[PDB]
Design an enzyme around this catalytic site. Sequence first.
Site, PDB file in Angstrom:
ATOM      1  N   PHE A   1      -0.398   3.541  22.260  1.00  0.00           N
ATOM      2  CA  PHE A   1      -0.932   2.352  21.574  1.00  0.00           C
ATOM      3  C   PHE A   1      -1.748   1.454  22.513  1.00  0.00           C
ATOM      4  O   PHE A   1      -1.753   0.235  22.397  1.00  0.00           O
ATOM      5  CB  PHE A   1       0.193   1.563  20.896  1.00  0.00           C
TER       6      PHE A   1
ATOM      7  N   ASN B   1      -3.627   2.785  13.025  1.00  0.00           N
ATOM      8  CA  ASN B   1      -5.079   2.693  13.123  1.00  0.00           C
ATOM      9  C   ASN B   1      -5.779   2.542  11.763  1.00  0.00           C
ATOM     10  O   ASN B   1      -6.773   1.806  11.662  1.00  0.00           O
ATOM     11  CB  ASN B   1      -5.648   3.858  13.930  1.00  0.00           C
TER      12      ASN B   1
ATOM     13  N   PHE C   1      -7.615  -9.296  13.916  1.00  0.00           N
ATOM     14  CA  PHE C   1      -8.435  -8.221  13.345  1.00  0.00           C
ATOM     15  C   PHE C   1      -9.029  -8.532  11.960  1.00  0.00           C
ATOM     16  O   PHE C   1      -9.034  -7.678  11.076  1.00  0.00           O
ATOM     17  CB  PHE C   1      -7.613  -6.936  13.277  1.00  0.00           C
TER      18      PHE C   1
ATOM     19  N   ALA D   1     -15.067 -10.157  10.695  1.00  0.00           N
ATOM     20  CA  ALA D   1     -16.222  -9.476  10.135  1.00  0.00           C
ATOM     21  C   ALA D   1     -17.317  -9.386  11.183  1.00  0.00           C
ATOM     22  O   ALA D   1     -17.427 -10.250  12.036  1.00  0.00           O
ATOM     23  CB  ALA D   1     -16.755 -10.233   8.914  1.00  0.00           C
ATOM     24  N   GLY D   2     -18.125  -8.341  11.095  1.00  0.00           N
ATOM     25  CA  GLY D   2     -19.322  -8.239  11.895  1.00  0.00           C
ATOM     26  C   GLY D   2     -20.153  -7.024  11.508  1.00  0.00           C
ATOM     27  O   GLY D   2     -20.334  -6.690  10.314  1.00  0.00           O
TER      28      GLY D   2
ATOM     29  N   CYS E   1     -11.630   6.078  18.672  1.00  0.00           N
ATOM     30  CA  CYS E   1     -10.339   6.159  17.991  1.00  0.00           C
ATOM     31  C   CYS E   1     -10.349   5.890  16.498  1.00  0.00           C
ATOM     32  O   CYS E   1      -9.928   6.752  15.721  1.00  0.00           O
ATOM     33  CB  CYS E   1      -9.338   5.244  18.673  1.00  0.00           C
TER      34      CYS E   1
END
Lengths: 455, 448, 451, 453
Positions: free
Chosen positions: A154, A217, A258, A261-262, A269
Amino acid sequence: SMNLTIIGSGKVGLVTGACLADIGHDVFCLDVDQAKIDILNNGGVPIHEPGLKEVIARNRSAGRLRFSTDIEAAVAHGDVQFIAVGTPPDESADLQYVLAAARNIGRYMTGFKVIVDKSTVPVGTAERVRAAVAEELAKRGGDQMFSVVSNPEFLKEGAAVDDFTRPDRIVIGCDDDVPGERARELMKKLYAPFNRNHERTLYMDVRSAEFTKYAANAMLATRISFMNELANLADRFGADIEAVRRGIGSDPRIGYHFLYAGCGYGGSCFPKDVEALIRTADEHGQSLQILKAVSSVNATQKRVLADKIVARFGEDLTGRTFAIWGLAFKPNTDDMREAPSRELIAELLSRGARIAAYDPVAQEEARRVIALDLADHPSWLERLSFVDDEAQAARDADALVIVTEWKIFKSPDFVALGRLWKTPVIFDGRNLYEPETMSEQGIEYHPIGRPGSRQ
Amino acid sequence: SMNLTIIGSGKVGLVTGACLADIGHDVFCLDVDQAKIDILNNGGVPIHEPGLKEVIARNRSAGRLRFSTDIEAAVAHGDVQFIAVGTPSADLQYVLAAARNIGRYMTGFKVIVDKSTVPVGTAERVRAAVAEELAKRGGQMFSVVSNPEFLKEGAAVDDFTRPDRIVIGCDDDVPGERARELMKKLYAPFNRNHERTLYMDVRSAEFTKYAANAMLATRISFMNELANLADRFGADIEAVRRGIGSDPRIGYHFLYAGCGYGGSCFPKDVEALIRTADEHGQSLQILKAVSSVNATQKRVLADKIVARFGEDLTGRTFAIWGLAFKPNTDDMREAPSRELIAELLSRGARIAAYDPVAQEEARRVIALDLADHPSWLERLSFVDDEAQAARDADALVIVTEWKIFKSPDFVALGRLWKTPVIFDGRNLYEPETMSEQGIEYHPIGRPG
Amino acid sequence: SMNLTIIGSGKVGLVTGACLADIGHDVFCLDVDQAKIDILNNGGVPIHEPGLKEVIARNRSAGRLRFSTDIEAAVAHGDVQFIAVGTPPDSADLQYVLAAARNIGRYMTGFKVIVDKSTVPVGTAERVRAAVAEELAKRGGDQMFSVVSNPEFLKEGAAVDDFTRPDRIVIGCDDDVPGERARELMKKLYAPFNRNHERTLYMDVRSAEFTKYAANAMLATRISFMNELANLADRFGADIEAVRRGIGSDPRIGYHFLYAGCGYGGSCFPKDVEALIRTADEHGQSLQILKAVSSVNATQKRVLADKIVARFGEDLTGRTFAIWGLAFKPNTDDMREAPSRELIAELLSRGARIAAYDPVAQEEARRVIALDLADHPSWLERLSFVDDEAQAARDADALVIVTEWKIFKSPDFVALGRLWKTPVIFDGRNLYEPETMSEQGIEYHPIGRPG
Amino acid sequence: SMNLTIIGSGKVGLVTGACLADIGHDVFCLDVDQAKIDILNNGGVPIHEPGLKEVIARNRSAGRLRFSTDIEAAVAHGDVQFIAVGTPPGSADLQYVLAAARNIGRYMTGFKVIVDKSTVPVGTAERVRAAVAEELAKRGGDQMFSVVSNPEFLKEGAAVDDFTRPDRIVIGCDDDVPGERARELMKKLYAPFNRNHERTLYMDVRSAEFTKYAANAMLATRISFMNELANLADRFGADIEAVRRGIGSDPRIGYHFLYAGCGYGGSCFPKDVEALIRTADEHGQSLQILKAVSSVNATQKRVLADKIVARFGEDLTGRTFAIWGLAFKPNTDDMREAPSRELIAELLSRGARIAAYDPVAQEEARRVIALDLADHPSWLERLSFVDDEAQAARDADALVIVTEWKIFKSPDFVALGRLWKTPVIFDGRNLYEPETMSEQGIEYHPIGRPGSR
Ligand SMILES: O=C(O)[C@H]1O[C@H](OP(=O)(O)OP(=O)(O)OC[C@H]2O[C@@H](n3ccc(=O)[nH]c3=O)[C@H](O)[C@@H]2O)[C@H](O)[C@@H](O)[C@@H]1O
Ligand SMILES: O=C(O)[C@H]1O[C@H](OP(=O)(O)OP(=O)(O)OC[C@H]2O[C@@H](n3ccc(=O)[nH]c3=O)[C@H](O)[C@@H]2O)[C@H](O)[C@@H](O)[C@@H]1O
Ligand SMILES: O=C(O)[C@H]1O[C@H](OP(=O)(O)OP(=O)(O)OC[C@H]2O[C@@H](n3ccc(=O)[nH]c3=O)[C@H](O)[C@@H]2O)[C@H](O)[C@@H](O)[C@@H]1O
Ligand SMILES: O=C(O)[C@H]1O[C@H](OP(=O)(O)OP(=O)(O)OC[C@H]2O[C@@H](n3ccc(=O)[nH]c3=O)[C@H](O)[C@@H]2O)[C@H](O)[C@@H](O)[C@@H]1O
């Protein structure tokens, strides 16, 4: 203190081996790439990981860390054998190096081994690793037993040494037969020093551990795609995606992390793991709708900067110049894999523009991969330059495009820049600046998911 | 201390008004349903909200809380006017109607607060309606503010008094900045430790509410898809939950796979956000998937049951534990139990349902659901005791994880059911505990 | 983006100034020591702080960070003026703080916000306010100001991380109109630290000033608490480490700072604890708990010598002791109030020879120990420093561990076996698991556990 | 599923036994008080513990939970024997524990695991081991056993929740063969509590025994710590609650148990803090911090009277005080070591009349205060209890808040204004925000904050 072998010397294996040594274990780190082994044994490090060099050195000189290509010596050494070799995309998910490692362990085993799948591998991989080793034991008449264990990884690229030493959790999946319960105790012993405050280790069955890695993920990817769709909707409603982020992150059930936005997610990964989970699922006759949507939104998002640029300057960018700030898929790394900058630069070059790119760290790697990306268009590459100084990229630019939010980009010399660009236009794929600060600085600002300023 | 009016007397308005009174404000709660107002004025409470009766009583007797249908007196009373009426894709009639009345009878500067969950840009429509009724009068200024609601049904009083955050959206003109200060004043007692309040523009506040519910909905559907994948890989969805919840970027909450989400909020809001987006020319792919996964999940129990006993359930009996859309409420809206019971009934089975609280509400809505099939309803009964439902059952199905279902009398049950089979839509029990108890266990996303 | 001045260039000012620059502010860092200023302006860094050199460099070349001794330019520059100068015991010396405060008053143009960052006694902000209001009266000044309390929560050697990712930011302001104006400015200044969870915490100034002391006092209390229990554990035959996990698992208590050992040291806990006790006696109150906490620590710093004397005798002439760890904690070179200094003195006074090793503090230790022991030249001749941990062990009667630097956690016990005179280890930090030591053939004396 | 015996039927035994049954074990709960046993077997519950009645009922009707006074049947039943009897007064009375131990030794068949659940002094498990090994020597007994420490971490009035969702489970075992066998059995027993995070924590038995006391002693320290700072805050003019937020926000310190007030009470902290200090003096060591902690609490329990006497005079004859809250903490009826008792005594002794109110402890308080004040009949005639919080205020010179029950958090200040003689409130728990009190026209005397007038 145990004797451990790590198979593979990339981020996962290099960091894992060095760090487990650093807590007093005797680590043999095996790989077949002799040059890699040679470089490590000469004090060099084949990866950009803060902290890693000093830990490797410390433990080599202390006799706790060794690098070699001697397969048999490696299996002889470790009672615990970490498989940490890579898993390259196929056609999805290439198990050849993992099974090859598994085979060698079976080929030369003396006594009871604990074989740990550290590399990110598809659910059920541990059964194939078990089948491969049990077979090589049948070609040898072996009354020696083993257990395969899942212990996923991780680590964040460029933060891997911290992430390993101060983990959120340690996931261990074991069988509950007698070999499995034996391997479990060994893992308990091995990881004890990480459980001295809160109990950081989390035990389960192996298939669940294997699954966990992917789900983790996949959820992080969903969060990002989620916010990206909403950001494009915010542009329509006239809302501010960043206000919404604070707005919904303040609910502890959602959390603050997390939700940025972008211009999309990249790297070695998320895209691989998301794709692999979708395939595995289709192969088991199930269509992951949400994940499929997540993957589609990202493919689209990587095109958003070009769209905004084309919408502002036209379909034909011949005669235009764009400064590109940030190339690596995220800050504090040099990894160009699946980087949004690559899709951006390609689109722009294809429409006739000249590009001057800057990145504090990934210049070389970018030049390499983008040349391969665009091999079929030599003439495009002739309109692409790299520069050594962020401001230099801006020379005669119609606009500046920000695609990776490296710290140096947060407080630029807007006056020095004013003296260099053709027009004070910035497209912002990472929302670095506050719109009205841009407005007062006389800058035509095009953020993602917020209102701009356009003057 | 300010004078506040709340328009609407359902969960949002009733709790908001009572609780704002309880911190010293003078609250006028307006509604048009005279029976509702009559009931409140006679010490009754039209909703199942722990805490709410005592707070309302306390504040009435203290002269801080009033209930009436007097529109004009309402507008006259409050300098801040909360619109907390309902929104039955996405019906703005009652919200605009309240807005009009405020415009129709205004004296001085009003702050109009959109509390009810309303689509982005609703506050401009509320502003247009009120400005017009002011033009038919030659009029005094106002600002429309967004202050969304984050109460969980059945836990609304706690959620209001100890909030995660308070979201306020204001214009940054001079009316807007005036309304802002008033809100600051109003909510001061909630900011005495950490600063709980969060200011933004009104369109972003409006949006926030929907995004929040949409993210929660996503987390659930996300785990549900994975749960159905776990069944194929032979993995344990619950292990996975621990496995990915331990990452603080993800968090531990709302990752409980099961038979789907229900209730008066998620389905409405998720649908509304999808529509609004299509109307602005954008197709929300993730949210559409999320909505599709849930429609499917609510059919998962029936599927498992039909897979185990056949397409024709004539001559089978199923015990149903849990009717309400979630525990600690009696709300039957969008409850998974309704889809389940329909499917089963339609295939010939007899159903005996039990719920500690929702029995009446369920009987009512399920009768309406199945109006066109009288003969089905004759095969449906409700019982007063969880174990009674099990009498002669081929299997027991758990659809709402009320606390009493967590430790059942498995021996008393053994004396009642026809076969010891349990389908579990909420994952209440540990599989191997069930195995040793001699029970054929069908959980969601785990091995049985 | 605002123009800030920081007065003082030690840990508090240097880090605060560099890091506030790094988020886009224009920082003037003022100090009177011209050599310190000269060193900074030549790319050097007078303190052992990971991260700090690169942040300073980054921001200098970017035009956001400047070092000077020009008092007037400093006052002219900043609308916000951080007092981050030092406060040397006495108990608690305010001279440099007041002196900074005066200069601000002496040359002020318009409205200043004066921020007490340095750790200062409750009510110091009123003295800072009196000093400045006066210098304004010697000038006929219709310019106003507010004094604010904004304490510091940096850990030595982790100061850059602690500043950029803070638990909380404490701001204490008056609620008059100047105060509420200074408050908004602090809100503006600290905005980038509040973008996720709201990290900033507002209160009145006296409460802010107090908080800093109470925070250090509670951490000190936790340690002294565990130390007393440790010495009690030796008597009950319990294991203090088991107890630590035992009581740390109650979230009301938490797991941190419950590490019994040979005591607390450094430039902060001892000074602040002492200060808070004095201030209290001066206000006619005797802090009993804190007084006890202070007394427990003075005792604990003698525990290693006691154990050693009890094992080898009152007269240590002819014995040799290896000392592993000198700095008051790991990852620093700070020797202030370090347990190693009291230990080494006791041992030398009884005739022993000492060979000390520390991966970072060798120079600093040689310097302070020489001063400590100036009256005893003959003692110092029995003290050496070595460059390699194992070397210290040559002919040692026992090895003593006083600072739990990571390199001490996994030693070459065989290499050592070839060097010491007897395999004896006194452990002031509980590094090793007793039975691991037992199987390694080692006579182990931990603190608060069975050996 | 195992057969367990629990010895003792107080908070510790009753909750432990009922809750272990509720997860499928077959529990025998033994006690000697036949009336207690009789009451339980008739659906009643001798303690104020939310949830407990339903769990007990559920598990009795299910055949998993039994109450009896049959000593031999009890020993015969359980392979695991929880000692959960009381430990009273002298400091720390081991008689009932040792007596239980003896009976186990007296009638043992095979291998027993004996679990010290009750809070007992370090090394108590050796005395329990000595007592049982002896009764085995008077019988010529091959049969072996191990003594185990498994302390209890239940909060009074929240004991059912605290048992079923524990922070941690502490188990201390020998590492000989019997001990390692008892360890496995405990692992088996507590498995259902380790299915998410691993909640169980193994150590040696002396460390387990110690843990329990240190845990209470640290909690006690935090409170006394804050109380000293509260009294210092009054002097500096700071706000102790601001300081609480100020230092609580450091994760190394944490937010909990930093509420200054009129001190700590109850059946646990004072007992355990005293016990730890004695045991320590008996081993020739003086716990200085704990001693100071104990001393600060004794003083804090006198702070309310002090503030009242400072305000109205040494002689309170002709004054009347309303007392809001009697129980040592909210959500219980336990009057042991309650601050209200020391307050009411002081006030009565100076001539005042007292009207006390508590939503739950009225009966228990009347009983114990009568016993506290037996030597002063005339004082008790000046003490009344009332059924409604506001009634206490009738003609009061002041209202005193000593237990922060939820109902006190939002009072009818107008109704009250019509009843008291002067609008004066002394607040031992800091319930109200000073300036809200100021605007309400109330003379407010909080602890460790600035008040009003
Ligand atoms: O499986 C792995 O080895 C690791 O994969 C990821 O790590 P990595 O890809 O190195 O870095 P991330 O920090 O996940 O970055 C992912 C991408 O998403 C983008 N992103 C991230 C966050 C965000 O809010 N928005 C956003 O677009 C980033 O710019 C970056 O391109 C995970 O973060 C690790 O926890 C996991 O161990
Ligand atoms: O918009 C609103 O007014 C409210 O709606 C929702 O709350 P609510 O619908 O009352 O009920 P929840 O407790 O959110 O549960 C909704 C559904 O999610 C399901 N659920 C929840 C969590 C989970 O892990 N899995 C899961 O299936 C529950 O069974 C339930 O049917 C939000 O949680 C509130 O914050 C919000 O204020
Ligand atoms: O006021 C300050 O400037 C700083 O002072 C201390 O930091 P520091 O002086 O660097 O040292 P600590 O890390 O606090 O350690 C204090 C001493 O206590 C000892 N200690 C610490 C923890 C423990 O469990 N046991 C223990 O003996 C340490 O070895 C060290 O000698 C505080 O930790 C910071 O929070 C504060 O900002
Ligand atoms: O050994 C035991 O049997 C139990 O004793 C205590 O629980 P309890 O006696 O119920 O009381 P607490 O809730 O711990 O509080 C005790 C006293 O401290 C007071 N207190 C607590 C916290 C605070 O900040 N200030 C404060 O004055 C309470 O008002 C009360 O007077 C411990 O909390 C439990 O861990 C333990 O299991």
